[PDB]
Amino acid sequence: AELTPEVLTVPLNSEGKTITLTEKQYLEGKRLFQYACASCHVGGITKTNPSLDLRTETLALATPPRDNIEGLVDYMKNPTTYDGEQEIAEVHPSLRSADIFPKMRNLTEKDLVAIAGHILVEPKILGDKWGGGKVYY
Amino acid sequence: GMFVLPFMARLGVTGSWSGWSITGETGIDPGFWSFEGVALAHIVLSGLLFLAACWH
Amino acid sequence: ELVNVVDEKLGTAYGEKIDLNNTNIAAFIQYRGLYPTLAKLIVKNAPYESVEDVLNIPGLTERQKQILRENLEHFTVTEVETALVEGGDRYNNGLYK
Amino acid sequence: AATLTYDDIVGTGLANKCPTLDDTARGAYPIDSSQTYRIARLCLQPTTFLVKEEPKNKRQEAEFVPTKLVTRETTSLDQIQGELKVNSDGSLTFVEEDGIDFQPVTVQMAGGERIPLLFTVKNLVASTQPNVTSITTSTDFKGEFNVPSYRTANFLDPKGRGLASGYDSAIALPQAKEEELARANVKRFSLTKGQISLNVAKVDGRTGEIAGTFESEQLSDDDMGAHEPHEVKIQGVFYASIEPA
Amino acid sequence: INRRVQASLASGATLEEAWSAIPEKLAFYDYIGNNPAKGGLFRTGPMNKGDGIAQA
Numbered sequence: 001a002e003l004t005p006e007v008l009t010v011p012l013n014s015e016g017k018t019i020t021l022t023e024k025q026y027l028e029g030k031r032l033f034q035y036a037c038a039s040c041h042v043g044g045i046t047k048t049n050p051s052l053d054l055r056t057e058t059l060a061l062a063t064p065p066r067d068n069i070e071g072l073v074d075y076m077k078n079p080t081t082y083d084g085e086q087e088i089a090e091v092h093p094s095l096r097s098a099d100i101f102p103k104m105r106n107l108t109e110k111d112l113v114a115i116a117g118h119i120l121v122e123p124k125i126l127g128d129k130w131g132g133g134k135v136y137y
Numbered sequence: 138g139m140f141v142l143p144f145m146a147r148l149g150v151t152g153s154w155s156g157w158s159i160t161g162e163t164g165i166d167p168g169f170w171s172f173e174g175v176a177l178a179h180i181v182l183s184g185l186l187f188l189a190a191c192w193h
Numbered sequence: 194e195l196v197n198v199v200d201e202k203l204g205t206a207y208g209e210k211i212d213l214n215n216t217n218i219a220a221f222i223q224y225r226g227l228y229p230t231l232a233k234l235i236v237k238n239a240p241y242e243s244v245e246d247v248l249n250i251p252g253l254t255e256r257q258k259q260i261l262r263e264n265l266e267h268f269t270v271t272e273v274e275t276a277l278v279e280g281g282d283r284y285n286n287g288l289y290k
Numbered sequence: 291a292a293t294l295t296y297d298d299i300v301g302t303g304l305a306n307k308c309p310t311l312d313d314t315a316r317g318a319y320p321i322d323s324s325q326t327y328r329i330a331r332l333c334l335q336p337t338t339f340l341v342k343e344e345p346k347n348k349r350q351e352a353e354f355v356p357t358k359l360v361t362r363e364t365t366s367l368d369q370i371q372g373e374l375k376v377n378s379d380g381s382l383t384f385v386e387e388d389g390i391d392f393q394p395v396t397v398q399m400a401g402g403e404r405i406p407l408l409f410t411v412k413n414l415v416a417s418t419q420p421n422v423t424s425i426t427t428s429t430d431f432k433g434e435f436n437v438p439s440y441r442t443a444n445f446l447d448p449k450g451r452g453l454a455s456g457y458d459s460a461i462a463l464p465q466a467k468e469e470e471l472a473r474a475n476v477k478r479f480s481l482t483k484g485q486i487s488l489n490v491a492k493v494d495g496r497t498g499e500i501a502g503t504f505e506s507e508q509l510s511d512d513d514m515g516a517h518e519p520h521e522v523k524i525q526g527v528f529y530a531s532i533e534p535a
Numbered sequence: 536i537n538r539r540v541q542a543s544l545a546s547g548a549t550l551e552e553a554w555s556a557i558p559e560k561l562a563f564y565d566y567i568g569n570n571p572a573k574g575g576l577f578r579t580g581p582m583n584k585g586d587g588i589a590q591a
C-alpha cells in the first residue's frame with residue numbers, strides 16, 4: 001500500500017469540490033497537528049472532551065459542516081461548539097485566540113490547509129483507529 | 138461450647154475491645170482487661186515463662 | 194422476580210432511539226444541531242409525556258423548535274429509570290472513549 | 291470573630307462543622323408573605339449515628355444503638371440552597387434545589403459489623419407549622435427526602451458484576467447453577483424515602499440566620515440488592531441563612 | 536455431528552428428527568467440560584466434582 005494521490009484527495013468545500021494534497025503538504029500538516037493539536041487530539045480523539053472526536057463522520061454532522069478543508073480552516077480561525085451556537089476561541093486554539101494560544105501565531109493559510117488535510121487523510125489510512133481511542137491501539 | 142469465657146466473666150471480665158459485653162450492653166469500654174487483653178496477657182506470660190525456663 | 198432494569202430497558206425504545214427521559218447527554222451528538230445547547234435544555238427539562246412535549250421547553254428559539262421537529266423521529270420517551278438518572282449520570286455516565 | 295480563611299481552617303476539623311450562633315440569638319425573623327424567600331445555605335452536621343438492632347423476636351422493642359464512625363470528618367451536608375415558600379396557611383416550605391446534600395458514611399456496631407449509609411437530604415421538602423409570621427425558637431421544619439442507592443449503577447462488585455456495567459454471572463463458577471446466585475448476580479437499585487425534623491434553637495432576627503438540632507431517619511446501604519438495609523437515625527446540629535429572594 | 540445432521544436433512548428428516556438422531560454420547564464429546572485442557576492443578580478429583588454428573 002502507498003500514500004497515493006487518491007488517498008490524498010479530500011473535499012475542499014461542501015459543494016463537491018476536492019483538492020489533491022501533495023505528500024509534502026500531508027507531512028507538514030502532520031507535523032503541525034503534532035506541534036499545535038496533539039496534546040489534546042492525539043490519534044483523533046479529544047482528551048479534554050472525549051465526547052467529540054475528529055472522525056470524518058463526526059465532522060460532517062458538525063454545524064457548520066467541518067468535513068472539508070474550508071470548514072476545518074474556518075474552525076482553526078473561529079472555533080464553535082458542535083451546534084455552531086457559541087464561539088469558543090477563548091478556550092480553544094485558533095488564529096483569533098493566538099494571543100492566548102501562542103502556538104497559533106504565524107500559522108499561515110497554507111499551514112491551516114495542511115493541518116485540515118491531515119485531519120481528513122488520517123482516517124482514510126487508519127480507519128477506526130482515528131478517533132477510536134485505546135480500544136483500537 | 139464456651140469453656141474459658143465463663144471463668145473470665147465470673148471474676149469481672151465481661152467486655153470486648155470490639156464494644157460488646159456478655160450482658161448484652163453496647164458501646165462499652167472495658168479498658169485493657171477485656172477478654173482480648175486477658176488472652177494477650179496470658180500469651181505474653183507464656184513467652185516470659187518460656188524464656189525463664191531456658192535460663193534455669 | 195429479579196431483573197436487571199438496564200438490560201430490560203434495552204428491549205424498549207430506549208434501545209432504539211434517544212430517550213429524552215433517560216439517555217445520557219452525549220447521545221445528542223449523533224445528529225446535527227442538538228449538542229450542546231439543545232442537549233442541555235432537554236436533559237434539564239425532562240421528563241416528557243411524549244416526544245413532542247420537547248417542543249414546549251421554556252425559552253426555546255424559533256430555530257431550535259425547527260431543529261427539534263426535524264429530530265423527533267430519532268427520539269423516544271420511556272418511564273424514568275432511577276438507575277440511569279441518579280448520580281448525575283445523564284451528564285456523565287463514566288464512559289469516555 | 292476573626293473571619294477564618296482556608297489556611298486558618300485547613301486540617302483542624304472545622305471544615306466539617308456547621309456555623310453556630312451564640313446565646314444572644316433568641317430573636318424572631320419576620321416573614322413578609324408578599325415577599326419570596328430562599329435558604330442561601332443549609333448545613334447539617336451529624337453528631338451521632340444510631341442503627342436499629344435487628345432482634346430475633348419479632349415482636350419485641352428493637353432499639354437504636356450507638357455506633358462508631360470510622361470514615362472521619364467527612365460526614366456533613368452543606369452549601370445546600372433552595373426556595374423557601376410562604377404558604378396560604380402561613381407555614382413555610384423549604385424546597386431543596388442543590389448543594390452538597392449527601393455523604394457516604396460508615397459506622398461500626400459493637401462486634402465489628404460495618405454499616406455504610408448514604409447520609410442525605412436529597413430533594414428535601416420540609417415545612418413548618420401554620421402561621422409562622424416570624425421564625426423563632428418555636429419554629430420547626432419536618433419533611434421527607436429521597437435516598438438513592440449508596441452505590442450508583444456503574445459500581446462493580448469484587449467479581450466484576452454490576453447493573454449498568456459488568457458481568458451478569460459468576461464467571462469463576464462457570465457450571466454452577468445460577469438460581470442460588472441470582473440475588474448476587476442481578477444488581478438492583480434502591481430508592482427509598484427518609485424523614486427529618488429540624489428544631490430551631492437559635493435565631494438572629496437581624497441577619498436571618500437560624501440554628502438548631504436535627505434528627506433524620508433513613509435506610510442504610512443494601513449493596514445493590516444483595517442484603518437488607520438497616521434503619522438509621524442521625525442526630526446533629528444545623529445552620530441555615532434565610533434571605534429574601 | 537453437522538455431517539450426520541446434514542445427511543439426515545438431505546434424506547428428508549425434519550430438523551427435530553435430524554438432531555434427535557444424534558447420539559447423546561457423540562454430543563457429549565462436543566462439550567468443553569470433557570476437554571482435558573480445562574482443569575487446574577489443585578482442582579482435585581473426578582470431572583463430576585466440577586460441572587456435575589451429566590444426566591442428559
Ligand code: CLA
Binds near residue numbers: 578580
Ligand atoms: C501417576 C500417578 C497418578 C495419577 C496420574 C493419578 C490420577 C488420578 N487419581 Mg490417583 N493415586 C495415585 C497416583 C496417581 N493418580 C497414588 C500414588 C495414590 C495413593 C496416594 C492415588 C490415590 C488416589 C485417590 C484416593 C483418588 C485419586 C484420584 C485420581 C484422579 C484425581 C487426581 C487429582 O485430583 O490429583 C490432584 C493432584 C495434585 C493436587 C498435585 C499434587 C502436587 C504435589 C503435592 C507436589 C509436591 C511438591 C513437593 C512437595 C516439592 C518438593 C520441593 C523440594 C525438592 C525442594 C486422577 C484420575 C481421585 C479420584 O477421583 O478417584 C476416583 C481420588 O479420590 N487417586
Ligand code: HEC
Binds near residue numbers: 053066072076081
Ligand atoms: C486541548 C486544550 C485542545 C487543543 C490543544 C486543541 N483542541 Fe480541538 N478541541 C478541543 C475540545 C475540548 C474540543 C471540543 C470543543 C467543543 O466544546 O465543541 C475540540 C474540538 C475540535 C474540533 C471539532 C471536532 C468536531 O467533531 O466537531 C476540531 C476540528 C478541532 N478541535 C481541531 C483542532 C485543531 C486543528 C487543533 C490544533 C490547531 C486543536 N483542535 C487543538 C480541545 C483542544
Ligand SMILES: CC1=C(/C=C/C(C)=C/C=C/C(C)=C/C=C/C=C(C)/C=C/C=C(C)/C=C/C2=C(C)CCCC2(C)C)C(C)(C)CCC1
Binds near residue numbers: 185186192
Ligand atoms: C505486677 C503486676 C502484674 C503481674 C505481673 C507478672 C505476672 C509478672 C511476670 C513476670 C515474669 C514472668 C517475668 C519473666 C522474666 C524472664 C526473663 C527476664 C528471662 C530471661 C531469659 C534469659 C536472659 C535467657 C537467656 C538464654 C536463652 C534465651 C537461650 C539459652 C541461652 C540463655 C540461657 C543465655 C499484673 C499484670 C497482674 C497487674 C499489674 C501489676
Ligand SMILES: CCCCCCCCCCCCO[C@@H]1O[C@H](CO)[C@@H](O[C@H]2O[C@H](CO)[C@@H](O)[C@H](O)[C@H]2O)[C@H](O)[C@H]1O
Binds near residue numbers: 204
Ligand atoms: C409532568 C412532567 C411530565 C411527566 C413525564 C413522565 C412520564 C414518563 C413518559 C411516558 C412514556 C410512556 O411509557 C413508555 O412507553 C414506551 C412505548 O410504549 C415503552 O417502550 C416500549 O418501546 C418499544 C418500541 O420499539 C417496545 O419494543 C417495548 O416492548 C416497550 O417497553 C416504555 O417501556 C414505557 O416506559
Ligand SMILES: CCCCCCCS[C@@H]1O[C@H](CO)[C@@H](O)[C@H](O)[C@H]1O
Binds near residue numbers: 167168169170
Ligand atoms: C500490651 C500493651 C498494653 C496496651 C495498654 C492500653 C491501655 S488502655 C487503658 O487500660 C486501663 C487499665 O484498666 C483502663 O483503666 C483505661 O480505661 C484504658 O484506656
Ligand SMILES: CCCCCCCS[C@@H]1O[C@H](CO)[C@@H](O)[C@H](O)[C@H]1O
Binds near residue numbers: 153154155167168170
Ligand atoms: C500487642 C499490641 C496490641 C494491643 C492493643 C491494645 C488495645 S487497647 C484498648 O483499645 C480499645 C479500642 O478498641 C478500648 O476499648 C480499650 O479501652 C483499650 O485499652
Ligand SMILES: CCCCCCCS[C@@H]1O[C@H](CO)[C@@H](O)[C@H](O)[C@H]1O
Binds near residue numbers: 153176400
Ligand atoms: C491479642 C488479641 C488481638 C486481636 C484482637 C482482635 C480484635 S477484638 C475482636 O474484634 C472483632 C471485630 O470487631 C469482634 O467480632 C470480636 O468479638 C472481638 O474479639
Ligand SMILES: [Ca+2]
Binds near residue numbers: 427428429489490491
Ligand atoms: Ca426550639
Ligand SMILES: [Cl-]
Ligand atoms: Cl462515537
